[PDB]
Amino acid sequence: MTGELEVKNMDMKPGSTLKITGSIADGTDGFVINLGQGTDKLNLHFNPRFSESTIVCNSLDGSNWGQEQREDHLCFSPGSEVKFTVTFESDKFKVKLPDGHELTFPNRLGHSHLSYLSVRGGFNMSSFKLK
Amino acid sequence: MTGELEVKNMDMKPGSTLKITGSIADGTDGFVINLGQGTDKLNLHFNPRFSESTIVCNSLDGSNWGQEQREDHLCFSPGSEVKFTVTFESDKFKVKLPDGHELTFPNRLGHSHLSYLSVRGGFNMSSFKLK
Numbered sequence: 001m002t003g004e005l006e007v008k009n010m011d012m013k014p015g016s017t018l019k020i021t022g023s024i025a026d027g028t029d030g031f032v033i034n035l036g037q038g039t040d041k042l043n044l045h046f047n048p049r050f051s052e053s054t055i056v057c058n059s060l061d062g063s064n065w066g067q068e069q070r071e072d073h074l075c076f077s078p079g080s081e082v083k084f085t086v087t088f089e090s091d092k093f094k095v096k097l098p099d100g101h102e103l104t105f106p107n108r109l110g111h112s113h114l115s116y117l118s119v120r121g122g123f124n125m126s127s128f129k130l131k
Numbered sequence: 132m133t134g135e136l137e138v139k140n141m142d143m144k145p146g147s148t149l150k151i152t153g154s155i156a157d158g159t160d161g162f163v164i165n166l167g168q169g170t171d172k173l174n175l176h177f178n179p180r181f182s183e184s185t186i187v188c189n190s191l192d193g194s195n196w197g198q199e200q201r202e203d204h205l206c207f208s209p210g211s212e213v214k215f216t217v218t219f220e221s222d223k224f225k226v227k228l229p230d231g232h233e234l235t236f237p238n239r240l241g242h243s244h245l246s247y248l249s250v251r252g253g254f255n256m257s258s259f260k261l262k
């Protein structure tokens with residue numbers, strides 16, 4: 001749980017962008033970027049899985065997971081230092097990948113401000129900036 | 132509470148540096164950057180007070196505040212975008228102010244790594260970077 005950052009009481013409004021930098025650990029099979037209103041309401045569950053060569057995106061409403069969206073476009077490595085840019089729109093999430101490719105994921109949980117960011121698995125966030 | 136950012140489960144070790152950027156809200160009497168083990172274990176309580184033209188540094192162990200240390204080097208103004216760099220040593224904290232002046236504050240709460248950051252008052256943190 002150490003190094004598994006959670007950022008609370010953010011105020012992410014539609015149109016804002018979040019840039020995340022960190023290093024992926026040697027020997028990790030995947031990691032998670034969770035962004036939403038809290039531990040119980042995840043608008044965006046962003047889960048690259050190196051062992052499955054895919055990126056799963058999903059939403060979480062309470063204890064009920066939404067329908068998973070897999071994006072076979074996993075073009076970064078374990079053991080690297082990478083950047084993610086998440087854009088919060090009222091209808092969609094816009095995740096720029098370290099290679100310039102962009103994933104889009106529908107926002108299924110309304111237009112509320114985003115206050116909760118958490119990192120799971122083998123990703124050590126070294127910087128974040130919010131605009 | 133909205134906008135009062137919390138960063139939990141950091142891994143800030145002796146020798147590590149924390150660079151925080153943000154904007155001071157207009158007409159505020161002060162703001163707070165807290166660094167420590169948790170909400171009740173604050174190794175560094177960094178509190179610029181513009182109503183008092185001084186920067187208060189203190190520690191919090193449970194419900195017990197230490198002795199305040201005031202530094203009459205408050206040379207930034209509300210509405211401005213300031214940047215602080217906090218360097219964590221087992222012996223003391225070093226806070227580089229926006230004009231370069233370095234403040235020292237003793238670590239009274241043990242060498243144990245820093246995992247908790249919180250911001251209060253008229254400060255909206257826009258970025259941090261751990262190095």
Ligand SMILES: OC[C@H]1O[C@@H](O[C@H]2[C@H](O)[C@@H](O)[C@H](O)O[C@@H]2CO)[C@H](O)[C@@H](O)[C@H]1O
Binds near residue numbers: 032045047058065068
């Ligand atoms: O929605 C993904 C989410 O749930 C877990 O993954 C599922 C898995 O995708 C599913 O095929 C299997 O039946 O159960 C797992 C757990 O319910 C993950 O643990 C988590 O990482 C999330 O990504």
